[PDB]
Design a protein around this ligand. Structure first.
Ligand SMILES: Nc1ncnc2c1ncn2[C@@H]1O[C@H](COP(=O)(O)OP(=O)(O)OC[C@H]2O[C@@H]([n+]3ccc4c(I)cccc4c3)[C@H](O)[C@@H]2O)[C@@H](O)[C@H]1O
Ligand SMILES: Nc1ncnc2c1ncn2[C@@H]1O[C@H](COP(=O)(O)OP(=O)(O)OC[C@H]2O[C@@H]([n+]3ccc4c(I)cccc4c3)[C@H](O)[C@@H]2O)[C@@H](O)[C@H]1O
Ligand SMILES: Nc1ncnc2c1ncn2[C@@H]1O[C@H](COP(=O)(O)OP(=O)(O)OC[C@H]2O[C@@H]([n+]3ccc4c(I)cccc4c3)[C@H](O)[C@@H]2O)[C@@H](O)[C@H]1O
Ligand SMILES: Nc1ncnc2c1ncn2[C@@H]1O[C@H](COP(=O)(O)OP(=O)(O)OC[C@H]2O[C@@H]([n+]3ccc4c(I)cccc4c3)[C@H](O)[C@@H]2O)[C@@H](O)[C@H]1O
Ligand SMILES: Nc1ncnc2c1ncn2[C@@H]1O[C@H](COP(=O)(O)OP(=O)(O)OC[C@H]2O[C@@H]([n+]3ccc4c(I)cccc4c3)[C@H](O)[C@@H]2O)[C@@H](O)[C@H]1O
Ligand SMILES: Nc1ncnc2c1ncn2[C@@H]1O[C@H](COP(=O)(O)OP(=O)(O)OC[C@H]2O[C@@H]([n+]3ccc4c(I)cccc4c3)[C@H](O)[C@@H]2O)[C@@H](O)[C@H]1O
Ligand SMILES: Nc1ncnc2c1ncn2[C@@H]1O[C@H](COP(=O)(O)OP(=O)(O)OC[C@H]2O[C@@H]([n+]3ccc4c(I)cccc4c3)[C@H](O)[C@@H]2O)[C@@H](O)[C@H]1O
Ligand SMILES: Nc1ncnc2c1ncn2[C@@H]1O[C@H](COP(=O)(O)OP(=O)(O)OC[C@H]2O[C@@H]([n+]3ccc4c(I)cccc4c3)[C@H](O)[C@@H]2O)[C@@H](O)[C@H]1O
Lengths: 140, 140, 140, 140, 140, 140, 140, 140
């Protein structure tokens, strides 16, 4: 299974996730993204099983990324699902912040709380080689 | 039996399906379609045993192709019947999306909810060369 | 150089226009379509230039095909603009008819009304191969 | 000297501008971007002196990328200042469409209004591989 | 193990905190600052485990540095709970004074009230060479 | 003579002026700061001669560093008096940004307008080493 | 422990207290002033114990010295707190008067009234040696 | 003859000046103060002829040390008479600042405004050892 798994929001952070894919690949990482690796069949059994098999779990944080996860107690939203699988399996979550404004824990569901307690990486357009060299530092 | 069976709405996807049917045949994929092989008076007992024979099932989801299917408990709608044999027989469904908007699962009857859970291909009018490849990779 | 220049409306004739092209170029003709052969630069020069360079002209009709062409007295529309260019030079126009309501000439621009007298070919949902012989016989 | 020169907005097209530069380099192109090639001194000379120095001119269009270019007849904006240099010197202009909604040519100033007449390349998230080869196809 | 551990507010004590780290390091110390040594994973378990291992404990005070610690009886504020673990563990608390005002001791939480009863060092910009030597003297 | 002359506002840039002095000294540069190289006598003669001496000119732009320069027609403020000297002799100006609100040129006196037209470096607390690496690239 | 303890009011007696130390020091006496001998750790225990260990006790009575001791029932004020420890251990109190006019002690707490009954010493600028020499004759 | 001449206001500078005198003497500078040297007879030609002989001219600037000199057009004030002799002879002036609020030049007579343009020394109660060391560098 690819080492890094990238979880993003389609209508908010598609360009960041694709830039993250390219730099990591040039540095010897095997990355998974849905618009490249997802194929024929039912798409539920491939997202959940692919998250587990990847050592790292990059989460792209872009403005209003977790708005749909709000009040999603039933666990229908597909960003709600992905974080839950990463926590329970205990992966190395590396949130990348790009214009994200953090809320307070009581606004989100109870299952996906531990993501807020992870050390993220600031994405900076002024010093990118420094931001990229830092992300590679976190990844295993 | 034909490699690919095409299911489309008569008053919507007729043009996409015909455009879709030709492209596959140029690539060695024998294709079945009603307007070319449907006769003999008793047509039910061939068209139902035409979707069983072909392993690949294509559901051309043109805008509002499921409109006349809600509350069809009798399952009289023809479009409803073809997919059922695909789900009952566990076929390889490859939906092609052209402007469709996905209703919530609770909307449509519970019987046919399976088709909503299959990864689908978005037909691109500007990059038609790459869209043809992605369909090939999905089809068996 | 191009031999057949195809005109259509992207909001209704996209699939129809795409289907026509594949057969004509299959038989050995040369075809120009915007979403393929159009190149870098300014296009208003190229389209009108390409329309002239094509001995054959094809028009695709469809409901809403000329809704935007109505009251285009300034010749800003691209369907109206390209039709007259071919019309003036006596280009071989081969219209294709579709399911739409025929509007009376007065509403449409007077200069463009001259194309209505050409011997169009109706598109058949059940005799697709029949139309290919009829249309390709019009060409050289 | 540089071969390509990328213009964009820093609050809407920086992720697409960064992804665009990465791919161009792998294919042997020398892309100029501000956050990398800009150094010490007065930047109004190196930017302009490099706009006219590169054969190709690339512009990234994003949601509302030209509003700061509207009614700015004073020419104080820099995306404006870069295009006129490319429009005037007759470089190869390659717009990229990423959610852009085209305005009618009247709103923008006169010296910039000829950019709307070029042939942009739609950015597709589903078919990024086909998008890049097109851009390279345009670059010369 | 880090010899020193700097606890500062981010929005006002970062310039003082970073200058301290440089001067302390040149004398052979091993300072811990979050932006340099905090890495991948949940961060709370790391610094609390790093302060406990920190022989000393520089607390940069800044105009309103402890503004956010009043009424934080929950022990959630981060400057707040950082001090408590060193009072609880009985470390060498060395307040650094740069523009700070001393309020009534009642308002602060009772778990951290012992912090106001320590000998502080006043930072001076006219005599920086002299305030650095005094800091190095307070460190054991 | 030295290599760098550092200008700041003592009320807000004192920490960033001392942080940038020690880093630049460790790289083999000679830095003039007012509270170290300034001895006894008429300081006006020494400041103006020190600005003229060092080839480089670093200006620490912090929140409001140019507020006192507004309406300074008489040229009495001392940060203003140093910038006019640097521009006139054509030195190498390297502004450093920190929380700065960039103003419209008109507010500042006409004498020192050219400072805003030089390329600067944004000070980053998370990526400080890359920032210091960038400054050394500007310096001569 | 010191041979003499200096208690003063920092907003008045600092300059005098600094002149007392530099004169008692030259006569062999060992002195405790807070600005130079107070160091790492908690300070309250060190200054209420230094009064105890001190062999002599000096109270610099300067304008406004005992204003803050007024109605200090809790004995928080350090000028108040340092006297009581001096009286309890039977120490020698040698007040120095510099423009101080003693009040009625009814208002003062009954635990401080003992100070005024001690033989005071007046500081004379004109005849410093006479007052310096008398102070030593009192230091026993 | 004395090498350092101390000017002070007896209602404020008496204590600091006496402190400043003792520290200077221990380092080997023959200092001149009125209470220690102003002999009998007529005192005008005593300290007016001394400052000229003394190379350095220290001036204690306690709160209101030049508030009586304001509008002293008659040269009556004795602090005024000493600055003019120091300036008019071109001596080395070393102001010592203690709780001073620097006035705007126009408030003072033109004869002695030149004393404000000398690099003064800020007296620090916490860092007197550095303060005293700094004066030694400023002396000659
Ligand atoms: N005895 C008779 N002989 C000849 N024509 C008859 C007839 N009775 C009725 N019609 C006509 O057929 C229409 C029903 O079609 P529609 O009402 O539009 O429904 P859909 O568009 O949803 O279906 C779209 C999908 O159905 C599958 N399909 C295939 C063959 C079908 C046949 I043969 C008959 C009916 C439905 C069929 C549906 C096909 O594969 C396609 O892909 C009626 O209106 C009549 O004009
Ligand atoms: N069967 C179907 N085939 C084609 N298109 C369909 C469809 N059903 C629905 N749509 C349409 O596609 C949109 C998706 O956007 P959303 O529903 O807002 O989801 P998100 O953007 O929040 O999550 C973003 C993250 O989820 C993971 N992911 C990966 C694949 C997914 C698929 I395939 C379907 C639905 C969610 C998916 C989520 C992946 O890792 C990604 O990075 C829907 O809205 C529909 O318009
Ligand atoms: N002297 C100074 N030094 C450092 N930073 C300064 C600064 N003055 C201002 N800022 C800050 O930098 C931001 C720039 O963002 P904007 O002013 O909104 O420009 P845009 O993003 O709209 O245009 C996008 C296109 O402009 C070209 N470009 C390149 C470099 C530029 C620089 I350097 C300054 C100003 C405009 C520039 C425009 C480039 O080719 C790009 O492709 C401002 O807002 C300030 O925060
Ligand atoms: N400068 C620009 N670069 C890139 N994309 C731009 C753009 N400006 C606008 N769009 C976008 O492309 C869409 C298409 O234009 P539409 O307004 O929908 O007109 P139609 O599609 O109905 O007519 C169809 C008939 O016109 C001929 N044709 C060919 C090429 C055209 C181009 I290139 C632009 C506009 C109209 C064109 C019409 C074509 O060969 C056929 O025969 C617009 O809506 C914009 O989303
Ligand atoms: N899960 C997340 N991952 C990444 N970034 C996140 C985040 N959540 C939130 N932010 C962002 O980072 C900021 C932190 O600054 P603040 O929240 O204002 O705290 P303070 O400045 O008041 O206290 C200053 C003292 O806190 C200690 N410290 C150290 C590390 C911390 C981390 I890592 C996260 C949150 C607080 C921390 C506090 C440190 O030792 C320092 O000395 C927030 O504001 C968010 O913008
Ligand atoms: N926790 C803290 N750490 C560092 N600095 C702190 C601080 N709290 C406060 N300040 C600062 O120090 C000033 C004290 O001024 P005050 O409290 O008004 O005292 P006084 O004016 O009466 O004159 C002084 C008299 O108190 C005895 N003394 C000696 C040492 C002291 C120390 I060390 C701390 C507090 C009080 C002290 C009192 C001394 O022996 C003499 O007799 C405040 O204003 C702050 O700027
Ligand atoms: N004939 C007389 N014999 C004896 N004592 C007399 C007297 N007439 C007047 N007083 C007394 O002196 C006071 C005026 O002192 P103040 O009003 O405070 O003025 P200052 O503080 O500026 O002076 C201090 C600064 O000036 C220089 N200095 C040096 C010597 C001075 C003398 I001798 C007299 C006046 C000012 C002098 C100033 C000195 O070197 C230092 O630098 C009056 O009240 C009388 O008690
Ligand atoms: N003769 C005197 N001796 C001692 N202290 C005096 C004094 N006169 C006045 N003060 C006091 O010192 C404060 C200075 O702070 P400010 O008034 O805000 O000035 P700035 O912020 O502009 O300075 C930031 C930049 O100015 C240059 N610089 C260098 C040396 C300066 C000197 I020497 C005096 C004044 C301004 C100077 C500015 C230097 O290069 C630095 O980088 C005033 O307010 C007075 O309280």
């Amino acid at each position: 299974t690819p080492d890094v798994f990238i979880s993003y929001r389609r209508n908010s952070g598609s360009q960041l996730a694709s830039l993250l894919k390219v730099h990591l690949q040039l540095h010897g990482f095997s990355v998974f993204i849905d618009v490249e690796k997802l194929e024929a069949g039912k798409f539920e059994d491939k997202l959940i099983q692919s998250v587990m098999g990847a050592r790292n779990f990059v989460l792209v944080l872009s403005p209003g990324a977790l708005d749909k996860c709000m009040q999603d107690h039933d666990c229908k939203d597909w960003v709600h699902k992905e974080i839950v699988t990463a926590l329970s399996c205990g992966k190395n979550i590396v949130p990348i912040i790009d214009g994200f404004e953090w809320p307070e824990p009581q606004v989100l569901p109870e299952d996906m709380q531990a993501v807020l307690t992870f050390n993220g990486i600031k994405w900076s357009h002024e010093y990118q080689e420094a931001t990229i060299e830092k992300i590679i530092r976190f990844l295993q």
